[PDB]
Amino acid sequence: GLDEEAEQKLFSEKRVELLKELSRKPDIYERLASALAPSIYEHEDIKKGILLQLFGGTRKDFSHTGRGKFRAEINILLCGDPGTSKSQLLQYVYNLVPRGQYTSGKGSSAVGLTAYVMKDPETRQLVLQTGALVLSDNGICCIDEFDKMNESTRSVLHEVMEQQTLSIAKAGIICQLNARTSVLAAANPIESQWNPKKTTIENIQLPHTLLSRFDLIFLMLDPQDEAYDRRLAHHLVALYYQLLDMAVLKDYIAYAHSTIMPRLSEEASQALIEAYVDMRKIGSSRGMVSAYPRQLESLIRLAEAHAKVRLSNKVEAIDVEEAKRLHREALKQSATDPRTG
């Protein structure tokens, strides 16, 4: 938790040195990703995105700039029919992270996600009560069935995912709560399956603004691969007839949050500028998910997260390259083409 991380005397010197060694290993990113969700098979890119979400970005103070808070959290959307493990991933994140809230389909409303007023049935006084997003203030909100979610409740997430605040202006009291939550959304394709006769944007069926608010989108498409099918079948049967330890995973993440505060190096800055220009060029097509300065900030956040994963404390070219590669492989820019579909 936040309090445990804030407390200084949390790790022994031996444990700190062990964590530093693990960060000094070459494939720590792959190791942590494989550690995540051991019961779900071969979602390497998705688990890397989840790991970067857990590590978060670099919290920055922009009060002097007069610019407004900057979201350091990583928002991830998963897209795929109800045959993939998107819901399982959301459940795993919910059961893993502290301050994890869960929502699904139409089982939520705007007031029930932000705040409301109830007569305290022990003092007979009208007290204000928080919603799921506020309850997961410094944690993660996992929103399954994000497609079957009416606009009235879906529109609240704009403020949460953009400003990390929540300005409730009702009769009694008007106040700006803080919901610095990380969104892990899961949405189904139109007609509950990814038909290969439609382009990605229409298959997703989400507003451009809502999709831009996400810094990662993973299209969990289904490749008709006999090898993949056989490996998954063996995985599941072995699961029925049944590593990197969770303890050291916790210690690594807590240490990274406590100490590592990655900053931008010159090479990383130039790489990010070039990457954003190239991303705009590639995404200026018709059916592709376009790119914006929001995507530039998404790359910045992912680079900071990778720096945290490496305990670098300095964002650099390798981090930027990993951010770009992840942001492309997720959303499968390669498999697409100017003639989107």
Partner DNA sequence: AAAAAAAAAAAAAAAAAAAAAAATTTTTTTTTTTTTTTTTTTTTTTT
Binding-site residue numbers are 41, 67, 86-87, 188, 213, 294, 297
Nearer to DNA, 23 or 193 (CB): 193
Q: Which of 25, 119, 281, 286 is the binder for DNA (CB under 7 A)?
A: 119
Task: State in angstroms the smallest separation of the CB of 126 from DNA.
Answer: 6
Residues in region 206-235 near DNA by CB under 7 A: none
Residue ranges for the binding site for ATP?
41, 67, 86-87, 188, 213, 294, 297
Q: Tell me, what DSSP letter sits at residue 264? A: B
Cβ nearer to DNA, comparing 176 with 192: 192
| Residue whose pair of structure tokens reads 């820019």 in the numeric block | 333
Which is closer to DNA, CB of 38 or CB of 82?
Answer: 82
- Minimum Å distance from CB 119 to DNA? 3
Say which residues have a Cβ less than 8 Å from residue 24's Cβ, sequence separation at least 6.
none
CA quadruple 318, 52, 245, 235: dihedral positive or negative? negative
Among 118, 236, 237, 273, interactor with DNA by CB under 7 A:
118
- Which two structure tokens, joined as six digits, stand for 96? 């893993």
3-class secondary-structure state, position 278: helix
* # binding residues, DNA (CB under 7 A): 5
**Minimum CB distance to DNA smaller for 159 or for 267:** 159
**Out of 39, 95, 129, 150, the residue judged to bind DNA by CB under 7 A:** 150
**Residue 149: how many other CB atoms lie within 10 Å:** 21
Q: How far is the CB of 175 from DNA (least distance, A)?
A: 20
**151 forms part of the interface with DNA (CB under 7 A):** yes
Q: How many CB atoms lie within 10 A of CB 253?
A: 20
| Rounded Cα gap, residues 154 and 148, in angstroms | 10
Instruction: Report d(CA 47, CA 16) in Å as an integer.
Output: 25
| 126 lies in the site for DNA, by CB under 7 A | yes
Kindly state the smallest distance separating residue 123's Cβ from DNA, in Å. Answer: 12
Residues in the site for DNA, rule: CB under 7 A? Answer: 118-119, 126, 150-151
